[PDB]
Amino acid sequence: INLVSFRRTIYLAIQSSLDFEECAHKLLKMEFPESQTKELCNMILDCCAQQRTYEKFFGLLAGRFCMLKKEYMESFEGIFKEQYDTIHRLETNKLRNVAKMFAHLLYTDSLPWSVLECIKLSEETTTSSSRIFVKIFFQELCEYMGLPKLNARLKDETLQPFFEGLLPRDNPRNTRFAINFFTSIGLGGLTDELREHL
Amino acid sequence: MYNGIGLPTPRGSGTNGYVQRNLSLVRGRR
Amino acid sequence: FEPLVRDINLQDEDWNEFNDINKIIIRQPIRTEYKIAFPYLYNNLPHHVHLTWYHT
Amino acid sequence: QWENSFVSVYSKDNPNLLFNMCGFECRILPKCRTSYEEFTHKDGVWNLQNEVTKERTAQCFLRVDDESMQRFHNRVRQILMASGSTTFTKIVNKWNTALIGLMTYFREAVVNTQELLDLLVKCENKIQTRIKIGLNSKMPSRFPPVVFYTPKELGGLGMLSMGHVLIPQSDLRWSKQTDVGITHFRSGMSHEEDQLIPNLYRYIQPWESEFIDSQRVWAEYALKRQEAIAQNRRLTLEDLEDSWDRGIPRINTLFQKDRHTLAYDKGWRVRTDFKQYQVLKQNPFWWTHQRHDGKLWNLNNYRTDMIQALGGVEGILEHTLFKGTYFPTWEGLFWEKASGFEESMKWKKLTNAQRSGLNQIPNRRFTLWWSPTINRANVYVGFQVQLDLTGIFMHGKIPTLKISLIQIFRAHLWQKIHESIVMDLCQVFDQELDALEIETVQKETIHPRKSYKMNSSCADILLFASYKWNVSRPSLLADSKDVMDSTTTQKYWIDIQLRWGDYDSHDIERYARAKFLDYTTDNMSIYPSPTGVLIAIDLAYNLHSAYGNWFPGSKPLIQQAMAKIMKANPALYVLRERIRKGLQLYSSEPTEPYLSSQNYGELFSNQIIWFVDDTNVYRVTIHKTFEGNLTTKPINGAIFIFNPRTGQLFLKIIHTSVWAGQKRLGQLAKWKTAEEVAALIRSLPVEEQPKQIIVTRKGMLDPLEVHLLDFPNIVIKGSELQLPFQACLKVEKFGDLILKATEPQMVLFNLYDDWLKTISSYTAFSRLILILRALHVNNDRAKVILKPDKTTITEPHHIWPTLTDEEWIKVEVQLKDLILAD
RNA sequence: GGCCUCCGAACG
């Protein structure tokens, strides 16, 4: 009941108040306790993917929202970890919205921290939802996120060794399958590290 | 007309929107 | 009260660039109470103003 | 135009770039040459990507539209200002229509600058304030957002407003020079209490949504048509599963029949711009014709989610919808919606009085449709009113309350509805005298000002008991079970009351209880002993209760008696009757049991059934004087009640004395006829009061339903049958009798003569009617035929001449084939 | 850290 009414008002103010960056004054004006913060982030992502198309206002509301307090960005890290557990459970059309919001917050990189480690599943084990969505978020996030500085700066950020599928050298299927999937997805020279390491 | 913001004529449009600072302006300032 | 003597807007591109500065000092966000009791702090329309009661 | 024209030249000195191209204007700056921070994408910005580099090269923030600003403000200026007295429904339809046309494509263009968005507050402010000007109220508390917006038949004007918003105005001129910041953004909506309305801007599609939409969709249809061209065709519902509605070039548009097959290569932009500059006006087309393009503006979650944010059933409870929906409880599903747009009006343009009266009802429908405007008590100039002979609380618009409410309340008969509920309780209490051992029970005298005074109490009826009423705390009727002390003194008497107001905020408990303790605390009028029962009912949403002492044999008695009696009262029959009659919108059930077929056979048995034709009550002589003008002088009419079984005919003549001084003589003939029939019913003892009344007109149906409320056993029904009592009338009886009638009087007539002895009432009835329409066409040739022999004579005391049965049959055949001839 | 224009009567 509390999450149903909280989602009814959160969705009512979500569909209203154009330029949601200003609507954050109302969202924070609701004064929801810490118990409603995690449910407000999960239901906030549900309303973000509930639209008929990818909306940048959801990415801005998540960037400023999660960027407000410590438990906010923490709720974005844990909520992103719970979002990584969706995979095939997520909708096909909503996967592009999750890749647009996750690519928008990933372009800023502020709130997400270990999200780069939670991604990159194994070589032959995938639901194709995280592979296709990883290709959409990798292409769009590569275009708008400064891919040369994102891959070059990400190589020294220790995000690749923290990710399972991004690990070069030892594992032949991770580096080789990462070179075939990356080069096949349009990464180009970004897979040269796993290609030479493999 | 407060500091930095105000409407000369409060009766000019609708009602005076008791604005504050927005829970997001502090996020952008920090 | 009202806008009083001010009609709508009066300004200039060269006057604003001379009076103000794109790069200037920033300390406090222009406290209105500081300019209230100090008619020299706010130079906009200082006409027919009874003010400046110092302390107590 | 030189100085009138504008241009911008970007160079190494100019850090950013801009242009005025197309509408509004554009601006762009490269991400590499931007020194401060990085590109900030929030609302008004835009992503400029380089296809060669496969990345975002620059960031483009464009502008607002000044020409479209003043074009929309002037469009609402001539729109609303040029619109005079008329229904606010279509006014808000064109208002929100064109306003959505300017809001069709806005996105970061209108969202960028707050100056253009600030004009919408004056837009909707002058819109709802304009409707309030039409209502002559202009009170903010009298028009909450509930009546401001609602889709379809929910009762709202359907206005879609983006009012509830706060523009990002920060640091005044200091930021006008700085142009960087967000703080303390505007104010908010017009009037919003713990709620926020929807916004069409947030529910629309940004230009980026069209970019990626037509991009990925153009690739989906691209590769789809590719593989369909190389491989076989395979054109099927898969394209529908591809979401053809995505993107402005909708696949469903190009896949249509008349679109791909019909029309032509050259687009519709020719007639768009040209015709937009041509004919008698322009229109709001920012893209192309509906045939050349579409799938852009779709309500969907705007109206759906709008009703979701609205109170819904709770909103109708806050309004007067559920109030008038009390008895028609099934009307909550929006069955019949509304009707009556054309009605009896001729074409469209007509006399100014026919146009004002044509717009009266819808303005009165939306006016009286919302009770709390004139009901809920407000501040400032809100004053008390007594209404007409019933009561009132808050003041308000004169035409709504007096005009619409008085028409809904009809005549003073509402006092007979209150006395009909009191007398309905007195007659509804029978075995209570035996159960409670009532020594003396007598109904007190009902004064016309007693029920009309809301401040004082009201006397209903008097009763008694063996000892007295057993009870302790005279709580409300809905109170739970409590210990009831004896406290036996003398006797007790029940009371009653009613409240027609308090739509939104009403409490039967606090107001009924505290009202009984108030009027009972002081001394105004106390019908019962200090220990007694006082009943209080409210006409809003069919409310009933009792604030008096609840006895173990009283509270259940009047409880269930108010369950069935308050379930359907005669006063409640007038409440739903006159209620739905004033609404004239949603009727989920027809009438019944209207006479069709079996009523003719049932007309001859051992029950009631009266045929009433008043058509000739109003008769005039139209003679043109030689000045060139018509003079209309009324002549005496008559009121008719016929008994099908016995042929008993009732004659009530109406005279120019009661035709004198009044106006609207057809409607006055309706009300006068129904009232006189009611009086005759009251005069023909309950055995001689009818079981049913058959009439030929709905204008007979409603007034009879108004006047007959005091006899619920009587059932009213209509009929399509044709009964020329006019022909008979002139013929012989009212030619001589109404021609000679000097005053209203009443005489029992037998139209079957000896038929009841010779033949059955059914044969006399059908033979009667056929020979009636005969008595018109051949009245002419009935005055020819009905004396077939020279010795045929009509006895002075009968209606008809004496003929042999075979001759009667010949008359039947000749006049029946006559009816076939017309 | 706060600022809350609103406010109807006839005639026509």
DSSP letters of chain C?
A: ---TT--S----HHHHHHHS-SS---SS---HHHHHS-TTT--S---S--------
Resolution in angstroms comes to: 5.9
3-class secondary-structure state, position D62: coil
Give strand pairing partners of D18: D27
Distance in Å, alpha carbon of B22 to nearest chain D alpha carbon: 7
Helix (H) or strand (E) segment spanning residue D737: helix D735-739
Taking CB atoms and an 8 Å limit, are A27 and B23 in contact across chains? yes
Collapsed DSSP state (helix, strand, coil) of residue D56: strand
Helix (H, G, I), strand (E, B) or coil at D715: strand
CB D548 within 8 A of CB D536: no
Neighbour count for residue D733 (Cβ, 10 Å) = 18
CA distances from C54 to C31, C32, C46, C50 (A): 18, 16, 18, 13
A68 within 8 A of B23, measured Cβ to Cβ:
yes
Residue D143 dihedral angles phi and psi, to the nearest 5°: -140, 80
Give the max Cα distance, chain D. 125
The closest of D165, D189, D79, D149 to D299, measured between CA atoms, is D149
Asked if the D385-586 domain carries CATH number 3.90.1570.40, the reply is: yes
What kind and span of H or E run contains D817?
helix D805-821
Q: What is the DSSP letter of D732?
A: I
What CA–CA distance (Å, rounded) separates D551 from A5? Answer: 44
Rounded to a whole number of angstroms, the CA Rg of chain A reads: 18
For E4, nearest residue by CA–C1' is B16
What DSSP letter does each residue of A12-67 carry, written as one string?
A: HHHHSSSSHHHHHHHHHHT---THHHHHHHHHHHHHHHSSSS--HHHHHHHHHHHT
Phi, psi of D47 (to 5 degrees): -95, 115
Q: Which residues pair with D620 in a beta bridge?
A: D634
For residue D370, what are its two tokens? Answer: 């919302």
- Among C3, C31, C32, beta carbon nearest to B8: C3
Q: Which residue has the tokens 């459970």?
A: A89
Q: Which residues contact D717 (CB under 8 A, 6 or more apart)?
A: D591, D592, D593, D594, D595, D599, D692, D693, D694, D695
Confirm whether any atom of chain E, the nucleic acid strand, is less than 7 Å from CB of B8: no
- Measured CA to CA, the distance from residue A34 to residue D563 in angstroms comes to 49
Q: Does strand E come within 7 Å of the CB of B7?
A: no
CA distance D253 to D155: 35
Query: Taking the C-alpha atoms of A26, A31, A33 and A35 in order, what is their torsion angle to the nearest 10 degrees?
Result: -20
Calpha distance D669→D618 (Å, rounded) = 7
C-alpha span between A197 and A182 (Å, rounded): 14
Contact between D469 and D492 under an 8 Å Cβ cutoff? The reply is: yes
Return d(Cα D522, Cα A157) in angstroms, integer: 86
Name the β-bridge partners of D27.
D18
Q: Is the CB of D139 within 7 Å of strand E?
A: yes
> E strand or H helix at D122, and its extent?
helix D114-134
Backbone angles phi, psi at D730, to 5 degrees: -45, -65
Q: How was this structure determined?
A: cryo-EM
User: Whole-angstrom Cα distance, residue D225 to residue D792?
Assistant: 95
Transcribe D173-240 into DSSP letters.
HHHHHH-----S-----SS-SS-----TTTTS--HHHHHHHHHHHHHHHHHHHHHHHHS----STHHH
Contact D641, D721 (CB under 8 A): no
- C2: contact with B, CB 8 A cutoff: yes
Structure tokens at A91: 């909708």
My answer on whether omega of the bond before D724 falls inside 30° of 0, hence cis, is: no
Q: Is D368 helix (H, G, I), strand (E, B) or coil?
A: helix
D19, containing H or E segment: strand D17-19
CB D156, CB D149: distance < 8 Å: yes
Asked if C20 reaches chain D (Cβ–Cβ under 8 Å), the answer is yes
Rounded Cα distance, D16 and D401, in Å: 62
Helix, strand, coil proportions of chain D in percent (round to 5)?
A: 40, 10, 50
Distance in angstroms (rounded) separating the CA atoms of residues D810 and D470: 77
What residue spans of D28-82 are helical by DSSP H?
A: 66-82
> Do the strands D629-635 and D619-625 form a parallel or antiparallel pair, or are they unpaired?
antiparallel
Residue whose CA lies closest to nucleotide E2 C1': B20
Q: In whole angstroms, what separates CA D605 from the centre of its chain?
A: 42
Q: What is the CA radius of gyration of chain D?
A: 37
CA dist D271 and D293 (Å) reads 14
Rounded to the nearest 10°, the torsion over CA D522, D524, D528, D533 is -60
D673 and D641 in contact (C-beta within 8 Å)? no
Find, among D317, D314, D313, the residue nearest to D333 by Cα: D313
Instruction: Calculate the alpha carbon distances from D18 to A129, D35, D189, D344, D450 in Å.
Output: 41, 18, 33, 60, 79
- The H or E element that residue D726 is part of is helix D725-728
The alpha-helical segments, DSSP class H, found in chain A are: 2-15, 20-29, 35-49, 56-66, 70-84, 92-108, 115-118, 129-144, 147-155, 159-162, 172-184, 192-197
Residue pointed to by tokens 């709802």: D128
Write the residue in D125, D175, D183 that is nearest to B21 by C-beta. Answer: D183
Name chain B contacts of A25, Cβ cutoff 8 Å.
20-25
Q: What are the phi and psi torsion angles at D639 (to 5°)?
A: -110, 135
Helices (H), D231-337: 238-241, 251-254, 257-260, 269-276, 301-309, 313-318, 321-324
SS3 category, D48: strand
Angle between helices D66-82 and D88-102 in degrees, nearest 10: 170
Q: Round to a whole number and report the distance in Å from the CA of D393 to the C1' of E9.
A: 18
| Closest of D638, D669, D623 to residue D738, by C-alpha | D638
CB-based burial label for D663 (10 Å; 0-12, 13-18, 19+) = exposed
| Residue D402 to residue D405: CA distance in whole angstroms | 5
Question: Is D481 in the C-facing interface, judged by CB distances under 8 Å?
Answer: no
- Asked whether D428 and D460 are in contact (CB, 8 A), the reply is no
Strand E bases near protein CB (under 7 Å) are 1-10
Pairing outcome for strands D17-19 and D26-30? antiparallel
- CB under 8 Å, gap of 24 or more: what pairs does D799-807 form? D799/D733, D799/D749, D799/D750, D799/D751, D799/D752, D799/D753, D800/D753, D805/D758
**What is the chain D residue with the closest CA to C17?**
D177
Q: How far apart are CA D166 and CA B3, in angstroms?
A: 17
In whole angstroms, what separates CA A17 from the centre of its chain?
24
What is the C-alpha to C-alpha distance for residues A9 and C51, in angstroms, rounded to an integer? 48
D191: CB within 7 A of chain E nucleic strand: yes
- Interacting residues of A56 by C-beta distance below 8 A, sequence separation 6+: A100, A104, D41, D206, D208
How far apart are alpha carbons A45 and A49 in whole angstroms?
6
Q: Which of D184, D186, D194, D197 to mutate to test the interface with B (most CBs of B within 10 A)?
A: D184
